Design a protein around this ligand. Structure first.
Ligand code: PCG
Ligand code: NA
Length: 127
């Protein structure tokens, strides 16, 4: 699966410019987690320490605005989420629910901070 992960990581726009050794270290520390259509992956308001990369399926992002949660957007394979709880405060700013059978590759804070955190595309991420 290490080779499987590495060729997947090389296909994502955000991670293909990273030295191969860093991609190798990521593929060794990530965890594969699976969800079913409608399952909550992330709940707004919880405190989190994990970043997610979608390797299969799609998810729906909703968020209770200041003014009922509002449908925000859909993310699919190759997309990633969960970076906000990893920048500054550790609170999740939105819900992310599985929209079908989903597989996510999960990286914890310890790994994110050393391997992914200094990436322009993710730190300079604006919605
Ligand atoms: N707050 C917010 N999060 C979004 C949006 N679109 C996708 N997300 C993801 O939803 C995630 C919820 O967990 P995080 O707040 O850690 O990180 C968030 C983002 O990666 C959006 O328009 N607003
Ligand atoms: Na934050």
């Amino acid at each position: 699966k290490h080779t499987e992960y590495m060729e997947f990581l090389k296909s994502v726009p955000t991670f293909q410019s990273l030295p191969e050794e860093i991609l190798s270290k990521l593929a060794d520390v990530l965890e594969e987690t699976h969800y079913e259509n409608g399952e909550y992956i992330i709940r707004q308001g919880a405190r989190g320490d994990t970043f997610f990369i979608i390797s299969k399926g799609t998810v729906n992002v909703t968020r209770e605005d200041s003014p009922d949660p509002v449908f925000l957007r859909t993310l699919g394979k190759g997309d990633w989420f969960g970076e906000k709880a990893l920048q500054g405060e550790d609170v999740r700013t939105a819900n992310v629910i599985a929209a079908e059978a989903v597989t996510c590759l999960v990286i914890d804070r310890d790994s994110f901070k050393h391997l992914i955190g200094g990436l322009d595309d993710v730190s300079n991420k604006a919605y």
